[PDB]
Short mmCIF file of C-alpha atoms in Angstrom, two decimals:
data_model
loop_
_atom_site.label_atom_id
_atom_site.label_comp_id
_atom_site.label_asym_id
_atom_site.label_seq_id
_atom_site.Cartn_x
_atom_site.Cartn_y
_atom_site.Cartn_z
CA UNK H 1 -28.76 -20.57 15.79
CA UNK H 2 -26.27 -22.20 13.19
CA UNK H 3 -22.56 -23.19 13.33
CA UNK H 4 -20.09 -21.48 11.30
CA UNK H 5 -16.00 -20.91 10.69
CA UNK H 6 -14.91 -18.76 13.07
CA UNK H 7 -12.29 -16.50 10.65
CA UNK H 8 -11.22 -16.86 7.04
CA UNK H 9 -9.62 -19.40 5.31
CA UNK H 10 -6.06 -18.37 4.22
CA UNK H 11 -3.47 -18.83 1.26
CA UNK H 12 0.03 -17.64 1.35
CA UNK H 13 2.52 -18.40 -1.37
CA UNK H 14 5.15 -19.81 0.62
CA UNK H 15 7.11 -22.47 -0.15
CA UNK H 16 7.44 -24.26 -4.01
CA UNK H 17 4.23 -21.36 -5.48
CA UNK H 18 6.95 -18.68 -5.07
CA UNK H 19 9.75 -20.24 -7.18
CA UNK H 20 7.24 -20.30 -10.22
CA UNK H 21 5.67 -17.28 -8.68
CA UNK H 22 9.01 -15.31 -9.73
CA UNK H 23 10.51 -17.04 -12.09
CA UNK H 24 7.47 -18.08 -14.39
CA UNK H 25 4.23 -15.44 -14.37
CA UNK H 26 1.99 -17.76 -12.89
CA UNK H 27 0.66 -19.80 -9.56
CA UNK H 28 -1.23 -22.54 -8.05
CA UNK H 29 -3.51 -23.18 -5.39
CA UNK H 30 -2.67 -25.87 -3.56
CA UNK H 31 0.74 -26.48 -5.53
CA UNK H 32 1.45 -29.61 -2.66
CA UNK H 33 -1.19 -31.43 -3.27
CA UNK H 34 -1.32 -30.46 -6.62
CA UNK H 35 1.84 -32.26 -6.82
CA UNK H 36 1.07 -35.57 -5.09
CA UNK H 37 -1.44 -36.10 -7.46
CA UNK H 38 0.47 -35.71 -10.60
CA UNK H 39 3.73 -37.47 -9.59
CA UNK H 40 3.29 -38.93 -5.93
CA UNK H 41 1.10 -41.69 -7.36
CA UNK H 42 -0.59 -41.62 -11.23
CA UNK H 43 -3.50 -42.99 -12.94
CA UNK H 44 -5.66 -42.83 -10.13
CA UNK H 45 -9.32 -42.19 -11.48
CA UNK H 46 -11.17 -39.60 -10.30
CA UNK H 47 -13.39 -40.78 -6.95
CA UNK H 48 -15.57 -38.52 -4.60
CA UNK H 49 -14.88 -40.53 -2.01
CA UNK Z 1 46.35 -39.49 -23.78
CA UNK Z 2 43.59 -37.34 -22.50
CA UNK Z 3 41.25 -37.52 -19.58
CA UNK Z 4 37.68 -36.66 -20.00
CA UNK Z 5 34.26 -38.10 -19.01
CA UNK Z 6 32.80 -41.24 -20.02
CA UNK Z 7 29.23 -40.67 -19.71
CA UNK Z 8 26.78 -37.98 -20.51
CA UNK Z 9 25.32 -36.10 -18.25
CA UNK Z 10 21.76 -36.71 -17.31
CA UNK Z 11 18.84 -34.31 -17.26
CA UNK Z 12 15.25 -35.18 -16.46
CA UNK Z 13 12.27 -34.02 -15.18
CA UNK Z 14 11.48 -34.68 -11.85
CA UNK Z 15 8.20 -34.36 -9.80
CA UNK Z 16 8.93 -30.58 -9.32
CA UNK Z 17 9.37 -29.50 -12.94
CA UNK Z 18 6.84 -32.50 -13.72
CA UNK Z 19 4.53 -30.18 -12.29
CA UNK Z 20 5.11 -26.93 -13.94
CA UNK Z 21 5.75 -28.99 -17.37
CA UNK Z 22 2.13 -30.54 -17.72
CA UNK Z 23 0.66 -27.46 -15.75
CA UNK Z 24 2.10 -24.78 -17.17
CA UNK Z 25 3.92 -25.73 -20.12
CA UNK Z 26 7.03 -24.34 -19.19
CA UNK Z 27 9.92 -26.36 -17.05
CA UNK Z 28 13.52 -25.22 -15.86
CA UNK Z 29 16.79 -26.67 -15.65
CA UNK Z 30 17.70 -27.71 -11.99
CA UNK Z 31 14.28 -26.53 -9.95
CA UNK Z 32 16.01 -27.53 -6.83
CA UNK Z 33 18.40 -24.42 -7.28
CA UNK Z 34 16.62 -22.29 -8.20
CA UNK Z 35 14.28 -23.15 -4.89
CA UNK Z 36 17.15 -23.25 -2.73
CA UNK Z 37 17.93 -19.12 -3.88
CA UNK Z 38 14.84 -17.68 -3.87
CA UNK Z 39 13.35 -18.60 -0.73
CA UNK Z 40 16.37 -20.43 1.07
CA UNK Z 41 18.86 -17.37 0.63
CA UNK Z 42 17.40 -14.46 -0.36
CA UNK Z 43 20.30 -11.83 0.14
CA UNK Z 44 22.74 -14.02 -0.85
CA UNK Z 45 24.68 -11.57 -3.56
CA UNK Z 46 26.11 -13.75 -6.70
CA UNK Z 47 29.60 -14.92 -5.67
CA UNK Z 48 32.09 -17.31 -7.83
CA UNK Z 49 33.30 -19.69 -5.35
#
């Protein structure tokens, strides 16, 4: 007997990934924390942690 | 005598077109209306007012 997700994960477009959805021809995954990683807070090495 | 403005005005890129300039190469002028058209108001028809 093992544990396991109980249903799929999902991704929907909503929010900022349509705007560039429609107007440009592409789209992120994740644009939020895309974002915050980018412009919330800069040259931050990479760290698996 | 004439009345104008006494400043240009100012256009950068913030941290939404940030993203879409490094990402994708491409930015826009004013992000924030085109996001407040597309998924705001959707039916809104194109007035002048």
């Amino acid at each position: 007997a093992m544990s396991g997700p109980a249903a799929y994960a999902s991704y929907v477009v909503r929010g900022a990934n349509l705007v560039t959805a429609v107007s440009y021809g592409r789209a992120m995954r994740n644009f939020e924390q895309f974002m915050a990683r980018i412009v919330d807070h800069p040259n931050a090495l990479p760290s698996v942690e």
